[PDB]
Design a protein around this motif. Structure first.
Motif, short mmCIF file in Angstrom:
data_model
loop_
_atom_site.label_atom_id
_atom_site.label_comp_id
_atom_site.label_asym_id
_atom_site.label_seq_id
_atom_site.Cartn_x
_atom_site.Cartn_y
_atom_site.Cartn_z
N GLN A 179 41.40 47.60 42.75
CA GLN A 179 40.14 48.43 42.39
C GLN A 179 38.83 48.85 43.41
O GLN A 179 38.72 50.39 43.54
N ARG B 151 43.68 43.16 40.56
CA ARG B 151 44.01 44.28 40.23
C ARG B 151 42.26 44.51 40.95
O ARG B 151 42.07 45.59 40.76
N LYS B 152 42.04 43.81 40.81
CA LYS B 152 39.90 43.79 41.40
C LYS B 152 40.10 44.23 42.82
O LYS B 152 39.29 45.33 43.05
N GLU B 153 40.85 43.84 43.68
CA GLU B 153 41.25 43.83 45.01
C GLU B 153 41.47 45.74 45.13
O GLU B 153 41.27 46.46 45.98
N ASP C 226 47.96 34.27 35.84
CA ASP C 226 47.36 35.74 34.45
C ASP C 226 45.85 35.76 36.06
O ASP C 226 46.03 37.39 36.46
N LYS C 227 45.24 35.34 36.21
CA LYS C 227 44.05 35.74 36.96
C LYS C 227 43.92 35.77 38.37
O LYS C 227 43.74 36.13 39.10
N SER C 228 45.17 35.12 38.97
CA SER C 228 45.76 35.81 40.34
C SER C 228 45.95 37.82 40.38
O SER C 228 45.38 38.24 41.00
N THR C 229 46.67 38.00 39.29
CA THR C 229 46.45 39.23 38.88
C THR C 229 45.91 39.80 38.97
O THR C 229 45.33 41.55 39.51
N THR C 230 44.89 39.72 37.75
CA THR C 230 43.71 39.57 38.05
C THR C 230 42.45 39.63 38.96
O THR C 230 42.16 41.09 39.16
N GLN C 231 42.24 39.09 40.27
CA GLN C 231 41.69 39.18 40.88
C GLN C 231 42.81 40.84 42.41
O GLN C 231 41.69 40.73 43.02
N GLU D 185 48.04 29.81 33.15
CA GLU D 185 46.29 30.89 33.62
C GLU D 185 46.06 31.31 35.44
O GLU D 185 45.53 32.02 35.48
#
Lengths: 49, 108
Positions: free
Chosen positions: B71, B67-69, B60-65, B57
Motif C-alpha cells: 500500500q 500488505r501495508k508495505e 496473519d500479521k506478517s501478510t498484513t504488514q 498469528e
C-alpha cells in the motif's frame, strides 16, 4: 503376432459371504499403514524444513 | 548514505522475511509435536494449542504488514544528476590541493 486377440471375455462369479473376520483386520491394518504414512510424512517434512 | 525513509523501509522488509522464517520454523515444531501426539502421550497436549495459535498469528500479521508495505508503494509515487555538479566538486578539490602545495608549512 502372438495370437489373434479375443482373449478377455466377460464372466460372472459371486461375491464371498462377509463376516467380522476380514474387514475389521483390513481396516485396522489400513490404519496401520496410514499411521506409517503419517510417520514418514512428519519425518520428511522435518527434514525438508 | 541513503535517506532514512528507505532505511526503515528495508528494516521493515527484513523484519518481514525474518517473520516468514519464524513461521516456517514454527511449522516445523508443530509438525514435530503432532507426531508424538498421534503416538499417544497426552503430556504435550496443552502445548499444541499454544503452538497452533502462535503459528496462525505469525502467519496473519506478517501478510498484513507486507500488505501495508505494498500500500505504501501506492502513495509513494510522486514523492546523471550528480554530474551536473560533479566537475564543480572536482574543481574545488583540485584547488584545495594547490593550497596545500602553495603553503609549505602545511606539508607535514
Amino acid at each position: 503376432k502372438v495370437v489373434k486377440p479375443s482373449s478377455l471375455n466377460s464372466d460372472k462369479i459371486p461375491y464371498v459371504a462377509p463376516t467380522k473376520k476380514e474387514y475389521i483386520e483390513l481396516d485396522i491394518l489400513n490404519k496401520g499403514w496410514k499411521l506409517q504414512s503419517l510417520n514418514e510424512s512428519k519425518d520428511l517434512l522435518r527434514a525438508s524444513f | 548514505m541513503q535517506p532514512p525513509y528507505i532505511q526503515e523501509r528495508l528494516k521493515s522488509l527484513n523484519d518481514i522475511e525474518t517473520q516468514l522464517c519464524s513461521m516456517l520454523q514454527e511449522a516445523s515444531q508443530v509438525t514435530f509435536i503432532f507426531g508424538e501426539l498421534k503416538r499417544g502421550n497426552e503430556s504435550v497436549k496443552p502445548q499444541f494449542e499454544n503452538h497452533v495459535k502462535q503459528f496462525y498469528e505469525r502467519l496473519d500479521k506478517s501478510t498484513t504488514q507486507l500488505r501495508k508495505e505494498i500500500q505504501l508503494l501506492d502513495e509513494n509515487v510522486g514523492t546523471n544528476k550528480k554530474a551536473l555538479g560533479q566537475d564543480t566538486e572536482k574543481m574545488e578539490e583540485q584547488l584545495d590541493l594547490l593550497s596545500a602545495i602553495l603553503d609549505p608549512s602545511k606539508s607535514k
